[PDB]
Amino acid sequence: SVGKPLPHDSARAHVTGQARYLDDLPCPANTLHLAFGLSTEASAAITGLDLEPVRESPGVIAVFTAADLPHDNDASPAPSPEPVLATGEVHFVGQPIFLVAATSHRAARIAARKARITYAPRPAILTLDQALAADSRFEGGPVIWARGDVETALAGAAHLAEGCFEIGGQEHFYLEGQAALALPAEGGVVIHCSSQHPSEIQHKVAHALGLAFHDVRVEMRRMGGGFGGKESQGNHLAIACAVAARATGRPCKMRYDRDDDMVITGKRHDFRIRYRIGADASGKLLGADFVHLARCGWSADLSLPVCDRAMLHADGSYFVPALRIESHRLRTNTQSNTAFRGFGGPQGALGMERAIEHLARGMGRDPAELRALNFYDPPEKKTQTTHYGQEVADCVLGELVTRLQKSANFTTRRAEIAAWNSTNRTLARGIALSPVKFGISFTLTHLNQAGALVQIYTDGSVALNHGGTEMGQGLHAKMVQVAAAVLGIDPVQVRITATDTSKVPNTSATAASSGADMNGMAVKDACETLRGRLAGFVAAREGCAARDVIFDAGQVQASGKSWRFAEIVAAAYMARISLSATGFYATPKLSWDRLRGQGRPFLYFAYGAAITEVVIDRLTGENRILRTDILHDAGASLNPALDIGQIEGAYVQGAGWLTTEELVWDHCGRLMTHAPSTYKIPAFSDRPRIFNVALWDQPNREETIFRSKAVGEPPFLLGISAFLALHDACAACGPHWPDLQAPATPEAVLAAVRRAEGRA
Amino acid sequence: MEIAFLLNGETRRVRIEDPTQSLLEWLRAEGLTGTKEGCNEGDCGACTVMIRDAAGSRAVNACLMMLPQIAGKALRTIEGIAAPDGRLHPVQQAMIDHHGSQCGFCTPGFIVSMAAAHDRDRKDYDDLLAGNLCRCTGYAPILRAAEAAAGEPPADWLQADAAFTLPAFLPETSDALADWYLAHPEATLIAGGTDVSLWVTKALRDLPEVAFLSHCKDLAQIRETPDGYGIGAGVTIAALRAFAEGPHPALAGLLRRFASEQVRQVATIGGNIANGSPIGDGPPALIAMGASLTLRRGQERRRMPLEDFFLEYRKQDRRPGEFVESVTLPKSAPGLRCYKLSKRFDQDISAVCGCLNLTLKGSKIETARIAFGGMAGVPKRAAAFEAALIGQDFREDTIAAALPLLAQDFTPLSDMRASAAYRMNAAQAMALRYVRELSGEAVAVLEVMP
Ligand SMILES: Cc1cc2nc3c(=O)[nH]c(=O)nc-3n(C[C@H](O)[C@H](O)[C@H](O)COP(=O)(O)OP(=O)(O)OC[C@H]3O[C@@H](n4cnc5c(N)ncnc54)[C@H](O)[C@@H]3O)c2cc1C
Ligand SMILES: Nc1nc2c(c(=O)[nH]1)N[C@H]1C(S)=C(S)[C@@H](COP(=O)(O)O)O[C@H]1N2
Ligand code: HPA
Ligand code: MOM
Ligand code: FES
Ligand code: FES
Ligand SMILES: [Ca+2]
């Protein structure tokens, strides 16, 4: 039923409160509960560790230290180790030093704080300048890519804008926290956990326990949100439970309390971006010189590919004849930053957007017009390439943006705001349009693979299993629709089973928006092997070619006769044909050199555009989004309803990142914003008062699952339009460049207002 | 100790041994796993449960509420929003229809919040669901769902709970409390629990000697006295906002952005005042409108200006064995305005909170009642700014001239909420705001058409 706006696979179960998340699962009466004892120091040696008051705390059954760990003490997804429990020294405020196994979740939590720890404090590395000065970084020096000669182009540039601005991080704030459960099962363990990558959980747990991979099994049914934060951060808990279960003999369960969750786990890499951008007398871009200062935290984690995507997307939506990026992946004594919806992409894009906005303002030109002038060309000379040298033969932005501007009534609205602004002096309106060009595929190429397993039972019903994990993006229904489309049956016949490493092995993470893309094909492959078997069985029985056997609407047709689907399956069963099949997919055409900054890392791009309108308060900096208009390319969408949902959601998260969401550390590396009381994600009323989401409906050029496009991450970047419109609102305060900083909090907005006004 | 209540349409009797245990924890231990834990801080609304009694029906946070409080009430969780026969509530179906869920984890909370809203035909969804955080959907589909289910009859099985009943001290009346607290000065008094329960869930504190004030009708009164309105300490913020709708639109307009609906329903004015927070939003409003506080030490009944109650940070003019009894508001205060400033509008505590209330004797400023929160460690009036404003012409330039005196009135603080500079700047910003508003100028961001 591909293309039909069907609901989410657990929509009713959600609504009835019958959907199980990890902590909802039933487990044996003797299930112990776990909690970490955290470092209160950003950079120190541990001189003394007295865990006596911890052991003597009520209900505590076991206490664990790095020394107690039977094998591996590494949780990082990177080739560089990251201790699960601190090894003689601590690297940030919140680093787990010890593990507590107690008979209740409260007991463990209480016991965790009764620690007696002495430190030998060392100098911390908290700001980017400190790291840059002390050379506290990863990859041994920066990564630099260049196309053409920026310095030459900028030297003879008819127009030029220089600048530099901060972009703050972002805490995921998935509603369900990090959580895992380990069940000892005769020589091996079974892990239930709230993770985006069950195959890596297996890997890390196996090494922790000194077991071969075939002794560890990860089941994962649904997550209460993930957003990238569960791509790796789950490792620490699953290891903790695996290790504690091995020692105590009992099942172990661990879930972070919200304050623990925000202190321990990483966030979105915050960036400082320096830019130099040059233009033509006509307005064509000559060159753009970028410098990325990225905060990676006390550990590698997934920083390497994160900053790689920041660079890859530093072109924005624009052809630049010469471009350079200098990428510093700096290490700081703060939380180890991780994956987050966009995966470094939104930072690189925003750098290009802030720059082109500044350039436009510098030459007194309409930013929309300038961007329009500088998009990549439509399909149908040799094709323009990106700065990393990939052909952009699918760029629809010229046409798309035009459509969106007319439907949103852009030109008229802009004028109407000009008038409104000139009648007001306390409140100012702002409107802006920002485009999206997001590449699709893991930049770590070999991860571009997926698997499926399909069962057809004698009653005609179907069990569908794949490697992708449901974190709320509607992946499961999409797969069901594919499976039902290929077999020629009603979706109701297809039941989704939980994600299981013993069912589909060697899976990648559910990330890079490739979940629907790759797994969709894997499902298709498995079903076509099944449909192929039944067609060939019918064909032989009825005497004819298998390609004449028609599977449609729960009915099979051959030789003018028609059976129900179930009637064929039972027959094929009686005939003795395998009604079980695997499916496998790997993304073709992908090849690039990470170091050289050259090649084709992506299969296709996902495009879109957003027009946002906002209002600001000149006295305080208070602000509201009044209306948004989005036109987004989901290819030939697999589920339009689900796809609208993803855009509405992603946009709000994107916008939220660049407004009320602000991470704050103290002078000691202590995160100050670690509760929902202090961290401010978009509330109900925060939604755009008018919200207009429409899909650009046009098939993919590349051969993807029913010519659809990955809609998972790209719409997150549409939140830039809000930050640009907030800047537009500042531009109508005075003649000066406002230099608005991200996130645009009330304080940040007031600052940029006063700058444009020229008030100290 | 034994209490009873109507859990999802069926009477349940519980043997309270731990009085501090939250309603969330109890329900999940019972296997009523549908109510989720999102934060355990009253912030996200994932644990939203629906209570009912004589007062009506309302949505509350299960994680904040402790068991003894639901005694003789009708509790209705997510697993009870659907009909006994299995038929889905108009709210539930509409959420499936309008794709109101994605990951699903915040759905139980919304459904309860919407069902309780549906039960009282309430429609201000922005305010109603402000206490409900969703990180997936963008809220847009949840609004459609709500509006689509609004054109439907109320659930009868939910309205059936109304016909119900028609270790920790629980006072019936103020007298009973006064006698007990007089002999027990070191006791932890619990009203709503929206501050006390954070000490147990987050600070991981134990509390011996406890009393619950939420079962004391004569403490929760809004009466009309010859001089004004004598509002009892047991009155909920949701109730105070409801009453102020008429007499004091400005306080009602401020209380809209107090916490959330799930918190306002159980949080009280006596609790907000007796907490003594420099970022507490009640006091700055009440001080600016010259409200008097009433304290009771059993039989002793001290009275004072509210501002005089707050001496220093973590220090109040409160005797041992003495409890906050009530406040008294004047019959009128037309010159009152209240500005709360924070990163986000809904469900976000103040950085600076300016309440201005000037009297005019025709162009000339007679009385200056200007109060601030978050500008000090104790809610206080802007002395020097107030003094230097008496007799002056009510115009911007005159106000603009006295603005610096606030830097001698306060020395703001810096933290994650705001920088000291900004707090100072925003305090002076609220003064220019006050003049512009009264001059009939557009100033409010929240009042702007899309
Ligand atoms: C999610 C959330 C949002 C919040 N938002 C805001 C906000 O926007 N603005 C704001 O000002 N506050 C806010 N608060 C905190 C606020 O102070 C309390 O929630 C509430 O106002 C206190 O009332 P209560 O009845 O819950 O008091 P309780 O929590 O019951 O008690 C708090 C303290 O006051 C004492 N006390 C209570 N009543 C009396 C009495 N009658 N006599 C003597 N002592 C008494 C108690 O012993 C205790 O020490 C928020 C809290 C939460 C959890
Ligand atoms: N509701 C919801 N949608 C979501 C997320 C989530 O946690 N919840 N995470 C996303 C992230 S980070 C990725 S990588 C994906 C993954 O699913 P897909 O690969 O099927 O798009 O979509 C996004 N959409
Ligand atoms: O885009 C990505 N997302 C997550 N992991 C990755 N590894 C390489 N690219 C990616
Ligand atoms: O950020 Mo999504 O690549 O997990
Ligand atoms: S769990 Fe977030 S409000 Fe109780
Ligand atoms: S739907 Fe996933 S958190 Fe609201
Ligand atoms: Ca996180």
Question: Which CATH number goes with the domain that contains B297?
Answer: 3.30.465.10
- Can you read off the two tokens belonging to residue B316? 């109040």
What is the phi/psi pair of residue B413, to 5°?
A: -110, 160
Specify if B404 maps to a domain: yes
Are both B271 and B199 inside the same structural domain?
Answer: no
Contact by Cβ (8 Å): B97, A640: no
Are both A699 and A753 inside the same structural domain?
Answer: yes
Are both B136 and B89 inside the same structural domain?
Answer: yes
- Can you read off the two tokens belonging to residue B355? 């309440």
* Among the listed residues A498, A19, A198, the one whose alpha carbon sits nearest the alpha carbon of residue B102: A19
Q: Count of alpha carbons within 13 Å of B352, Cβ hemisphere only? A: 32
- Can you read off the two tokens belonging to residue A536? 């060939």
* Angle at B132 (CA atoms; ends B126, B133), nearest 5 degrees: 110
> A295 forms bridges with which residues in the sheet?
A330
Are both B223 and B328 inside the same structural domain?
Answer: yes
Judged by CB atoms closer than 8 Å, whether chains meet at B126 and A8 is answered as no
Specify if B209 maps to a domain: yes
Distance CA A582, CA A523 (A): 8
Nearest ligand 4 atom to alpha carbon A229: 4
Are both A163 and A300 inside the same structural domain?
Answer: yes
* Among the listed residues B422, B274, B400, B252, the one whose alpha carbon sits nearest the alpha carbon of residue B350: B422
* Angle at A755 (CA atoms; ends A754, A760), nearest 5 degrees: 75
CB contact, 8 Å: B292 with chain A? no
Number of domain units in chain A: 5
The boundaries of the domain holding residue B93 are 81-166
Specify if B176 maps to a domain: yes
Contact by Cβ (8 Å): A264, A255: no
Torsion on CA atoms B442, B446, B448, B450, rounded to nearest 10: 170
* Among the listed residues A73, A80, A88, A125, the one whose alpha carbon sits nearest the alpha carbon of residue A668: A125
Specify if A400 maps to a domain: yes
Which candidate from A613, A627, A680 shows the least CB-CB separation from B344?
A: A680
Distance of alpha carbon A668 from the chain centroid? 29
Specify the DSSP class assigned to residue B66: B
Helices (H), A543-626: 565-575
Distance CA A351, CA A287 (A): 14
Are both A455 and A591 inside the same structural domain?
Answer: yes
Domain boundary among A231, A265, A299: A265
Contact by Cβ (8 Å): A616, A722: no
Are both B55 and B104 inside the same structural domain?
Answer: no
Domain boundary among A556, A574, A602: A602
- Can you read off the two tokens belonging to residue B386? 């107030």
* Among the listed residues A312, A170, A326, A271, the one whose alpha carbon sits nearest the alpha carbon of residue A719: A170
Judged by CB atoms closer than 8 Å, whether chains meet at A110 and B104 is answered as no
Specify if A499 maps to a domain: yes
The DSSP-derived string for A314-362 is TTTTB--SEEEEEEEEEE-SS------TTTTHHHHHHHHHHHHHHHHHH
Which candidate from A16, A677, A747 shows the least CB-CB separation from B82?
A: A16
Name residues whose C-beta falls within 8 Å of residue B249's C-beta, 6 or more positions apart in sequence: none
What is the phi/psi pair of residue A327, to 5°?
A: -110, 105
Domain boundary among B218, B245, B278: B218
Maximum C-alpha span of chain B = 71
Are both A597 and A610 inside the same structural domain?
Answer: no
Are both A188 and A230 inside the same structural domain?
Answer: yes
Contact by Cβ (8 Å): A294, A332: no
Specify if A180 maps to a domain: yes
Are both B226 and B289 inside the same structural domain?
Answer: yes
Which candidate from B33, B130, B449 shows the least CB-CB separation from A684?
A: B130
Specify if A350 maps to a domain: yes
Which helix (H) or strand (E) covers residue A286, if one does? strand A285-297
Active-site residue A139, yes or no? Answer: no
* Among the listed residues A195, A231, A21, A106, the one whose alpha carbon sits nearest the alpha carbon of residue B46: A21
Residues closing a segment before a gap in chain B (C–N exceeding 2.5 Å): 166
CB contact, 8 Å: B446 with chain A? yes
Distance CA A356, CA A34 (A): 50
Distance CA A48, CA A116 (A): 8
- Burial of residue A498, with CB atoms counted within 10 A of its CB: 0-12 exposed, 13-18 middle, 19 or more buried: middle
CB contact burial B109-128 (16+ within 10 A = b; e otherwise):
bbbbbbbbbbbeebeebbbb
Q: Which of residues 41-100 of A touch B (CB under 8 A)?
A: none
Are both B102 and B68 inside the same structural domain?
Answer: no
Specify if B446 maps to a domain: no
Distance CA A514, CA A624 (A): 34
Pocket test for ligand 4, best of A343, A440, A508, A602 (most atoms within 8 A of CB): A343
* Among the listed residues B421, B340, B334, the one whose alpha carbon sits nearest the alpha carbon of residue B369: B334
Specify if A108 maps to a domain: yes
- Residues of chain B contacting A268 with CB distance shorter than 8 Å: none
Are both B322 and B235 inside the same structural domain?
Answer: yes
In this structure, what CATH number is given to the domain that contains residue A47?
A: 3.90.1170.50
Are both B261 and B304 inside the same structural domain?
Answer: yes
Distance CA A569, CA A457 (A): 8
Specify if A128 maps to a domain: no
Specify if B448 maps to a domain: no
- State whether the Cα torsion A500-A502-A508-A513 is positive or negative: negative
User: In terms of CA atoms, which chain B residue is nearest residue A10?
Assistant: B104
Distance CA A469, CA A446 (A): 19
Specify if B445 maps to a domain: no
Q: Is the CB of B238 under 6 A from ligand 1?
A: no
Specify if B194 maps to a domain: yes
Number of domain units in chain B: 5
E strand spans, B261-399: 292-297, 300-305, 310-312, 315-316, 323-330, 336-341, 352-360, 365-373, 380-381
What is the phi/psi pair of residue A544, to 5°?
A: 175, -170
Are both A616 and A654 inside the same structural domain?
Answer: yes
In total, the C-beta contacts within 8 angstroms joining chain A to chain B are 237
Is it true that the peptide bond before A743 is cis, omega within 30 degrees of 0? yes
In this structure, what CATH number is given to the domain that contains residue A187?
A: 3.30.365.10
Judged by CB atoms closer than 8 Å, whether chains meet at B126 and A426 is answered as no
In this structure, what CATH number is given to the domain that contains residue B146?
A: 1.10.150.120
Are both A458 and A485 inside the same structural domain?
Answer: yes
* Angle at A470 (CA atoms; ends A516, A583), nearest 5 degrees: 50
Are both A384 and A423 inside the same structural domain?
Answer: no
- Residues of chain A contacting B46 with CB distance shorter than 8 Å: 175
Are both A185 and A278 inside the same structural domain?
Answer: no
Name the pairing type of β-strands A32-38 and A252-255.
parallel
Distances (CA, A) of A737 to A161, A172, A419, A730, A758: 11, 32, 21, 9, 9
Domain boundary among B80, B115, B139: B80
* Angle at B154 (CA atoms; ends B148, B155), nearest 5 degrees: 110
Judged by CB atoms closer than 8 Å, whether chains meet at B34 and A471 is answered as no
Specify if A130 maps to a domain: no
Entry field: residues in chain A: 760
- Burial of residue A141, with CB atoms counted within 10 A of its CB: 0-12 exposed, 13-18 middle, 19 or more buried: exposed
Are both B97 and B161 inside the same structural domain?
Answer: yes
CB contact, 8 Å: B242 with chain A? no
Distance CA A514, CA A197 (A): 13
* Among the listed residues A172, A261, A254, the one whose alpha carbon sits nearest the alpha carbon of residue A674: A261
Ligand nearest, relative to CA of residue B188:
1
The boundaries of the domain holding residue A570 are 444-602
Nearest ligand 2 atom to alpha carbon A229: 12
Domain boundary among A602, A637, A666: A602
Are both A624 and A689 inside the same structural domain?
Answer: yes
Name the pairing type of β-strands B48-53 and B56-61.
antiparallel
Are both B321 and B393 inside the same structural domain?
Answer: no
Shortest-distance Cα residue to atom 2 of ligand 3: A512
Domain boundary among B80, B109, B139: B80
* Among the listed residues A281, A437, A274, A276, the one whose alpha carbon sits nearest the alpha carbon of residue A373: A281
User: Which residue type, as a one-letter code, is found at position B225?
Assistant: T
E strand spans, A424-569: 427-440, 449-456, 462-466, 494-496, 499-500, 550-552, 555-558, 561-564
In this structure, what CATH number is given to the domain that contains residue B41?
A: 3.10.20.30
User: Which residue type, as a one-letter code, is found at position A604?
Assistant: Y
Are both A288 and A194 inside the same structural domain?
Answer: no
Residue with tokens 């922790």: A208
Are both B360 and B307 inside the same structural domain?
Answer: no
Distance CA A182, CA A196 (A): 17
Specify if B449 maps to a domain: no
Distance CA A315, CA A567 (A): 56
User: Which residue type, as a one-letter code, is found at position B269?
Assistant: I
- Can you read off the two tokens belonging to residue A612? 């946002």
Q: Is the CB of B47 under 6 A from ligand 5?
A: yes
List residues, by chain if needed, whose CB lies under 5 Å from ion ligand 7. A 172, 229, 265
Contact by Cβ (8 Å): B19, B11: no
Judged by CB atoms closer than 8 Å, whether chains meet at A19 and B104 is answered as yes
Judged by CB atoms closer than 8 Å, whether chains meet at A641 and B102 is answered as no
Contact by Cβ (8 Å): A27, A64: no
Is it true that the peptide bond before B68 is cis, omega within 30 degrees of 0? no
Entry field: residues in chain B: 450
CB contact, 8 Å: A750 with chain B? yes
Name residues whose C-beta falls within 8 Å of residue A56's C-beta, 6 or more positions apart in sequence: none
- Closest-CA distance of chain B to residue A619, Å: 5
The SS3 call for residue A53 is helix
- Of A219, A470, A613, A713, the active-site residue reads A713
- Experiment type: X-ray
